[model samples]
Target chain A: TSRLTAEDINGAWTIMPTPSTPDASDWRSTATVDLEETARIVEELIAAGVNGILSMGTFGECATLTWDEKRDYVSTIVETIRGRVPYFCGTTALNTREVIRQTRELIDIGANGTMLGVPMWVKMDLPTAVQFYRDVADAVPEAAIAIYANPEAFKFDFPRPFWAEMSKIPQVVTAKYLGIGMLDLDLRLAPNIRFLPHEDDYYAAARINPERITAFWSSGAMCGPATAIMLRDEVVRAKSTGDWAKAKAISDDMRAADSTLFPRGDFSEFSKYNIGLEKARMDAAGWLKAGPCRPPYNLVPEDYLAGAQKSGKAWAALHAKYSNELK
Target chain B: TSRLTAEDINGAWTIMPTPSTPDASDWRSTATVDLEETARIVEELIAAGVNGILSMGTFGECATLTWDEKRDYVSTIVETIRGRVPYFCGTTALNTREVIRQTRELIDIGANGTMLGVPMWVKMDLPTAVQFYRDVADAVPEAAIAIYANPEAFKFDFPRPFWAEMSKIPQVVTAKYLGIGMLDLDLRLAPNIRFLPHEDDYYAAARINPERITAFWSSGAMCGPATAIMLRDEVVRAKSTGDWAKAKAISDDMRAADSTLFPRGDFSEFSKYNIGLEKARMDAAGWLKAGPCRPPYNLVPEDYLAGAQKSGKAWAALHAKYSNELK
Candidate 1:
């Protein structure tokens, strides 16, 4: 068990992608995750003075990872972090039995919490979703769950009732809301649930429910932690003091930097090859190694890669600009 | 490290399958592995007086199991057996790096050796196959490898030259040869390696090289250990005493009993639905709880199931026949 509890599930949590190597002849056919590089990224995040670290989230290409690779990543992250900060690893599977086993295993292995997304093979209704969560959480006591609710990833609508039921469960501490669910309304109903906003949407969400939305998630935080931390601190100050002047400028700059990571400065063009595009961006921006995507998710258009490379460089420059102030 | 080394790799090695639950709506789409049931199988295998237990092979539906489930099975088997007998767990992946990681991890987890199969996605040529073995075995120091060569499963023809190079590697100690390859010639060249023959083929191959061929593989060993042990003991005794009459008679009856597992009392009709048929047979014969096959492999024709049930009953009778004499 972690010293940090469900109540502690708030702050800038960085989701680290699985680093891989193109060991096979065809890049798309075979992808081997590089454990050394994966471990290095965890060290990079902790050294960057980040509050929490999550591995294998959506941007982490959680779907692409095999069951073993997730364990390897979780162990590596937990070992490297040494519980200096809260470490939550994603535990997901095609079924609840498998998911519960993984959740219990990760928690047993030292993950402070688990980022759980519903099984994607079949879409779940509200009751099914409620039971699934209740079964997993109850089965694995002290399993602080960061509900990974993404319609695009899971292909299921996260109805407001699901949030209401989830809020009733103490183990359902937080959520990584990726452009789905009744975020504003549900947060009002979800007294216990801390709905995390995207890096781009943090300021906007904070403006609406600053006191309620205490933390945010950022892929950029993994790529450029210094800048991400700066954004968080700036936003927190604005939220606390209700002084928008400095916070507004910093948030704008951070959003612009995030936009640079996308093609044509728009995330819409980044569809179908999210893994490859994200890896490409981090490859250019991060000091740690970021390898190619796994099979079926490896192929990204060269033009998009070019844009991602530029985005990484832009993030690097922006991160460097904040390094002097934060680090 | 296991007291059972490459030199100690002999006797009846049972290919136990991954135990699963069809927790999902469609059995094919999502299968959750039952760890308690899986661990129970290991305990049953140990208590039933089996020589060794191999989990997640072709009969074990190695391809269907996820990476995490393999570890759970491996640990369960190892812990339950407690070094009473030799244990070689199958470790397979798409590429050398991934395969090596599994090889090292399983070995680290106390498996006697790993059954290494070539990547099924892209078939390996002789040279590629040789290098893949060399790289994995060399990278994972002291890794005893049971080269899992199944042409029917991997769709790769293992030539005589591949076996020669494999024999040269001290790590390539044994092979689970499921058809394909010039087994006779390869075994002659492979001084360090013991080519494990199928139960049906064992008597024939042992008749050819009684002094050389030592151990054999059988799914029957897992289903009905007493009878399988009797076959192995009778064959070993025949080879030692050079008595053809008794060995020939038992071998004939064994072959007949094995043929019962197939539809129309023929092995050829058992194509494509090998996993389901074998699982059905085990379900009927064994006292241990064996569930339905994982997705895509779950479907078995009802007519075939009838034949399998008959075959299982036959094995059960055979095992009981030997139990009074042997147990």
Candidate 2:
């Protein structure tokens, strides 16, 4: 068993809001974003013990932001984190040059790492994807790289062969794995690259960690505090006890918490009301103070807060039913 | 006499160059051209006796300009011209938004008139073309409007029947008749719209001026001076004498001149060389100075220039033969 493994990522990490502007789809008028409020939310996420924030990812509503806007925002987010934790910035773009430019800009802003995803507009084959990653690696050799292999990104494969090719590049030190069928295939091909399977699916991912994969963490769990707590607890228990039975008990609690929180779709306004849910859970657990999501991301609605509060009660009850309280 | 009559449109029309930067196949970049050479060409064309210039028309390279760029270029050209000549602009946008925007921008630029061809990405049926034009008319009611009917425009012909229906719009001031086989039909329906048969077959166009449609002078003759000479002679002969035979004789000479200038394809060295030939003939006619072309539109090769000069001589001979010159 590896001494330092996927289970270690169970603790605090960073959370950056997706860079969404309201007027992106409307096309007729300018976007309205209160920057002061955005800054406030960011500071609050930091105060809530988020180790690293992501800027230009899909959740950041990156598709609409212009090149200049993305670069500026990435720099701002990295700076706001203040070196308390490693800032992993998003480098999603339509082309290779854009990826290089955005990545370099984030690096210049003191970003500790970057999340490089596939260019979503074009159907890029493996070779092309390698070239895209290589170009970025060459540009910012000093910065650590995190290549995310989401199957839904343009093509429905892990880009295993491509990621294998990119792993040979010196700067690309990490791999955020997804796409159930191909994650192991990609991980096998590039074991040197820190393969961190984004553990959004709590049950499925918990089974793979510290054995088939070296590291793991949630991609979307940060949106709901209970889910984050569930993931953190599972990683802690799975590592501490190293017993499958204890892991199962923790996984069952996570399933109950998520079921209560997201009774609707996997993703929705209520499900992603991170501020209130995160703040409430952290306050009860005496962790950190978090505020509301700013305009465009929309503040956690009253109904969503009410839903989160109800889900909070359900999460606590489920935890009580499990073996014991999570540390 | 026909109830409908076209407004006078003669003088130098500047052709807007498409953007050479990222060679996108779509027509968007054509209008974003910021070069001063375009404005200079506009000034020169107007100074050469073109009474009114049509920006974003066939002559302006409308096929490549996108909606925003097309509208912007039209406005900029009009602004640059500063009212030395009445400006008429063209819009062949595939979408309704672009068409409306271009139309409104043209009106705002103090344009006296607008020309429209059916959106050509698909076959716009008569009703679609008519309604599209009517919508455009409503958007820019301040300007005189003309419909362009050219078989070369899209896959099919927009015939006299369609013309009759479209002419009912109040601002429908002109119909540029560009039918090859249906010139007679176009002339027959002359009363339905201000018929300006932009047919290069000058003899036929002049002969069918039964209602003195020579007053409309709808034609596309691009070898510049010699072509303009022929058109001017045909209009003058027909209008002053009311003698169809005289106009036809002049028109025949114009046709013979054209054959000398444009021997083959539109983009051949022959056609590219026509600019020099045009300058040479105009020089021979003592029209203006400046005999060379700019980069991208280079001076014709020496051999091509020599051939063009020979053709220019023949064309000038025809001009003399028809107009009964002093020589």
For candidate 1, the clash count comes to: 0
TM-score of model 1's chain A, to 2 decimals? 0.91
For each candidate, report what fraction of the true interface contacts it reproduces.
0.00, 0.00
Scored against the true structure, residue B218 in model 2 reaches a CA lDDT of 23
Global fold similarity of model 1 (TM-score): 0.53
TM-score of 2: 0.45
Q: In terms of docking quality, how is candidate 2 classified? A: incorrect
- Of all native A–B interface contacts, model 2 reproduces a fraction of 0.00
Model 2 agreement with the true structure over B129-240: per-residue lDDT tens digits: 5666776677667767767665443323676677666657767766655543665665556454556554345456545564434433322222233345545555666666
Name the runs in model 1 displaced over 4 angstroms.
A2-6, A22-31, A260-269, B1-327
lDDT of model 2 at position A149? 60
What's the lDDT for residue B85 in model 1?
80
